[PDB]
Symmetry: D2
Subunit: 172 residues, 4 copies
């Protein structure tokens, strides 16, 4: 229905944040004597992943996984990882954590493959809607309960290509 | 190079599956919850087809395809089409030996939190057991012989045989 | 809603038909100097495939493919074939052809892989609802416009395990 | 064994993509129909991320993963999430040379009958062309050098590099 997108987080603010995020992930896994892999969750994480891994100055791998989401459904794997994660630095890259329902199950599935380390990096965070206690090691921004778009996040499959995070305001 | 002779004839398979049908039927009789049989593609499609026709309990038929240093992949190429949360789930497989695949598969499905979770296998090689995995319904216990037929293949062959045969090499 | 399943095609009639179907597929590909593969379409074709290939007295392969269906959507591939079909006797095994919409696109996709021969075998057929002219080389039964169940075919994911084809009658 | 030196620096990539953004924008300006960019996973995720941010036309971002005697597989491991029928579809890929994958992919997507169907590639090796496939938008034309970076890998490595580099062997 009739809406309007207003700039919430400018392109410059995201670039600086990701710069620091990558400048937080680097010294974490700087001396780990094991291979590293970033796992992005399709579909709306491709832009976050692309910008983050370019700031991660650690020789790693980049993989993807498309999972269905809990919401109360079962978390199914539509597209699994290509490479293996057993004994590897796995860093789950998510665009937004509101409920934590989906991500909790994703982490549980990957944990079955027994990686050396398993962490989560998210760009946006809605603690306002948190339903499941799930540990997040890296958070870009903690945001209000606003329906956001841009930077991978969609609204009716739209606005994914926006270089900034915007809020949706229904014309009423 | 090879030839194939019959180990477990078609008639003997039908008799065993008929017995398996009765066992599974009484176990999940008067359970109340929904039931679903999950087959592990590919070589379990035939076993599933004959087994589910012997299970006289209103159940669903779902499928799943898994992939194969210690357990290289066990990825999910094709996940289930339906939910299993709060249902009675019976995993249908043709062969169990090392227990690698069934162990991880049971773990993955356990995360969806079904009411019950059992395993029904057509064949079983107890000698190759690397991982102790609980199996309730076993069709046949066989020695470490390489077998084919009834869904089981050798280099993509003999999947359509109505019997379980052995591969002798020349 | 409240319904009742009545026997339409008994188990004996199907077994005899499949016996003849396999006794129609065998002498077709009896002397073909190329590998053969049966392609079943998940999910409701597993029972048909299992019984048919046991009557096909020709050394072949058995593969599966899960496709989304046209209905007006795009036919997408949820699960593709494991093995290749280029230069092989491909026989698409379907449980029911009502519109032909889905199967037409499935055949087009497989045809791109350039097999030697490409045919279709179906158990049930509803010419009453045929929307797309699609050549079917093997038909088990031509049926009325009755909502059928059993033998792989479902109704709200039910009745798949039935050894017979049954019709659904709504209690009114 | 190896080392990696820069061929196409980060700055040069951004400048080229900026130019590509304007070209694609005018081509699909005042088209009316819906637009969608289809990326070929994996090594096109970064290119897609930077390219779609330069395309100033309301479009969708979909993805697809394909597999690789003549064209052994070209199976679809992960199909698109949305329909493309009656839409303007632009295939986004990193490297084109043999033209094997792009040819079949274009064929598969053509069956869904979109309004238009074009291809945008980051790199191009015209020397290895086995199949003549139409490509409208090309980022860089390079000789037959094995390159990495910007999504492109060598044994699952260097995918995260912000630049296009060459692999020299020792
Ligand atoms: N379009 C949109 N705008 C929002 O502000 C929003 N918040 C949550 N969601 C979706 C809920 N969803 C958040 C992430 O899913 C988004 C699907 P993706 O963008 O394809 O990755 C729950 C997953 P979780 O349990 O791990 O937190 C939103 N979607
Ligand atoms: N094709 C074949 N023939 C055999 O005689 C055999 N014995 C063990 N295996 C191992 C295959 N088996 C895989 C069974 O999954 C279905 C794949 P398909 O047998 O190729 O159709 C592993 C059981 P595990 O997880 O307990 O080790 C055999 N495979
Ligand atoms: N449950 C049920 N009962 C029916 O009598 C019936 N007729 C068509 N359909 C579904 C329509 N559908 C028929 C086959 O799809 C059934 C899904 P499957 O059982 O998982 O294979 C159109 C495909 P087509 O374009 O190739 O003919 C039915 N479903
Ligand atoms: N990794 C890599 N590095 C190269 O320098 C290269 N040159 C050609 N190719 C061929 C790979 N290329 C596949 C590109 O798809 C993305 C897979 P990814 O490059 O491993 O991320 C085939 C293009 P074609 O269908 O025209 O033959 C290369 N691959
Ligand atoms: Mg996400
Ligand atoms: Mg069907």
């Amino acid at each position: 229905m009739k809406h309007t997108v207003e700039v919430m987080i400018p392109e410059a603010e995201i670039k600086a944040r990701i710069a620091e995020l990558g400048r937080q992930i680097t010294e974490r896994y700087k001396d780990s004597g094991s291979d590293m892999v970033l796992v992005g969750l399709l579909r709306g994480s491709f832009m976050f992943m692309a910008d983050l891994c370019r700031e991660v100055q650690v020789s790693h791998e980049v993989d993807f996984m498309t999972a269905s989401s809990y919401g109360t459904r079962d978390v199914k794997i539509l597209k699994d990882l290509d490479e293996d994660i057993r004994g590897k630095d796995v860093l789950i890259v998510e665009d937004i954590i509101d409920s934590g329902n989906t991500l909790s199950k994703v982490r549980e599935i990957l944990s079955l493959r027994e990686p050396k380390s398993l962490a989560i990096c998210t760009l946006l965070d809605k603690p306002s809607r948190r339903e499941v206690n799930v540990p997040v090691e890296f958070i870009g921004f903690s945001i209000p309960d606003e329906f956001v778009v841009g930077y991978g996040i969609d609204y009716a499959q739209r606005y994914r290509h926006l270089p900034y995070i915007g809020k949706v305001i229904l014309l009423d």
